[PDB]
Design a protein around this ligand. Structure first.
Ligand code: MG
Length: 376
């Protein structure tokens, strides 16, 4: 199994104990590390942060401590939008300009591949032809990478993609059987399945549907989404389940009405380190739990939630990660990806569960590292 871990280049700006840089990563936890994000200018890949080149070096130097580790660079993301991708794929010349720039960039800075995070072809402004042109891009990139491997006498660069977990976005965006032949891994974003775009509480990454959900609401769970990809042509061994190391918070309209599907009035209060209403890192979650919140296990969906007065939290913990890891192995998927390792309790000082409790849980459950026998 694979354990693919995203690192974000803005985590460094969080205050105090929230600040996270590449040298804070334990190099033995994951099998693949992905650097989020690079950008694009004039149809070529580029850096975004002033110190990206310095961080790139520190990131890829982690391979000196774990010879099996592979690193990838991700391009795009939610805030990047779609317009630069649409223009880049619209002509063969623009795609070749981009692909050539990628090969040079990855080899220059020591990355083993590119992760495409276009969110999403065919949605958010992207016109319908981008569904097919995304396949064309991935095909041409895979072929270019195969040719570069022969010409430079080096192992081929990898090409992966982060893909939608919402059904409407999947149908508008991806030619699943063709795309599956050219991608090395398919990282399915099976999180943010509920949030304050809806007017009621719901879980971030439930494994199963809630009993009352019907219609399109019955698709908002990990099991349905992963099986949708599989049943529509993606090989199970290339499919990677997304795991969030954060939760969403809501304000309850009525504190007595505090279950799943209860009416809400908006986002919960920002945490002191991530500073985003509606969102808490796992280490911020631990503070909330230990301050007196009530913790509930939702047995239908196999995830926890917690509330305190009019604040409600949908999240994941060690138990839900463990249940989902067992489930994914039983369904023969290729492994797990985490968004994002800088949101784990990496110092160990918030949750009393060791360093990197959530990420270590997946490392153990998928057998990446085993309990060694060192008695003598
Ligand atoms: Mg109700």
């Amino acid at each position: 199994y694979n354990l693919i871990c995203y690192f974000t280049n803005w985590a460094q700006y969080r205050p105090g104990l929230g600040s996270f840089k590449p040298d804070d990563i334990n190099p033995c936890l994951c099998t693949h590390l992905i650097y989020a994000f690079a950008g694009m200018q004039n149809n070529e890949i580029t850096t975004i942060e002033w110190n990206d080149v310095t961080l790139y070096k520190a990131f890829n130097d982690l391979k000196n401590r774990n010879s099996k580790l592979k690193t990838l660079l991700a391009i795009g993301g939610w805030n990047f939008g779609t317009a630069p991708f649409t223009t880049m794929v619209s002509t063969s010349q623009n795609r070749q300009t981009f692909i050539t720039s990628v090969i040079k960039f990855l080899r220059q800075y020591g990355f083993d591949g590119l992760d495409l995070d276009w969110e999403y072809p065919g949605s958010r402004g992207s016109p319908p032809q981008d569904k097919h042109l995304f396949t064309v891009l991935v095909k041409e990139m895979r072929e270019a990478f195969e040719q570069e491997a022969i010409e430079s006498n080096r192992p081929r660069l990898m090409v992966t993609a982060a893909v939608a977990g919402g059904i409407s976005n999947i149908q508008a965006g991806y030619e699943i059987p063709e795309l599956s032949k050219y991608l090395d891994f398919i990282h399915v974003m099976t999180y943010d399945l509920h949030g304050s775009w809806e007017g009621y509480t719901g879980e971030n990454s439930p494994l199963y549907k809630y009993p009352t959900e019907t219609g399109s609401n019955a698709y908002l769970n990990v099991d349905y989404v992963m099986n949708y990809w599989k049943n529509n042509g993606a090989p199970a061994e290339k499919l990677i389940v997304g795991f969030p190391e954060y939760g969403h918070t809501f304000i309850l309209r009525n504190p007595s009405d505090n279950g799943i599907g209860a009416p809400t009035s908006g986002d919960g209060p920002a945490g002191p380190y991530t500073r985003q209403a509606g969102f808490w890192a796992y280490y911020e979650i631990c503070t909330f739990l230990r301050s007196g919140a009530t913790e509930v296990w939702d047995a239908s969906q196999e995830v926890p939630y917690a509330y305190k007065a009019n604040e409600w939290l949908g999240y994941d913990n060690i138990k839900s990660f463990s249940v989902k890891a067992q489930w994914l192995k039983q369904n023969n998927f290729g492994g797990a990806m985490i968004w994002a390792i800088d949101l784990d309790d990496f110092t160990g000082s918030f949750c009393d569960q060791g360093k990197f409790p959530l990420t270590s849980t997946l490392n153990k459950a998928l057998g990446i590292s085993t309990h060694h026998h060192h008695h003598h």
